[PDB]
């Protein structure tokens, strides 16, 4: 099974490592999302 779980172990390691090592960058992403939500309601497609 160990080679059958190649993609599986790869996802298990790298997804956590990406969301983790970028966890402050993901905090930034949360900030960008909540800003775009709360403030950018009334705007047209060029500005949105």
């Amino acid at each position: 099974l160990i080679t059958s779980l190649s993609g599986e172990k790869d996802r298990w390691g790298k997804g956590a490592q990406d969301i983790s090592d970028q966890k402050r960058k993901l905090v930034g992403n949360v900030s960008l999302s909540t800003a775009f939500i709360s403030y950018c309601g009334p705007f047209n497609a060029e500005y949105r």
Partner: protein, 49 residues
């Protein structure tokens, strides 16, 4: 565009509310998923040993 737009500190407060709430939500949910990434690490470790 000659279209009226306004702002208030209330929206800033609401924005902080959204930040706190959706952050605890996504932190806890995605970190239970990352806890499951660590469960994958546990599977790899137990298999190897």
């Amino acid at each position: 565009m000659r279209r009226q737009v306004y702002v208030t500190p209330k929206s800033f407060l609401s924005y902080l509310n959204s930040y706190k709430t959706l952050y605890i939500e996504k932190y806890d949910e995605l970190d239970q998923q990352e806890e499951s990434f660590k469960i994958g690490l546990n599977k790899i470790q137990e298999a190897t040993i």
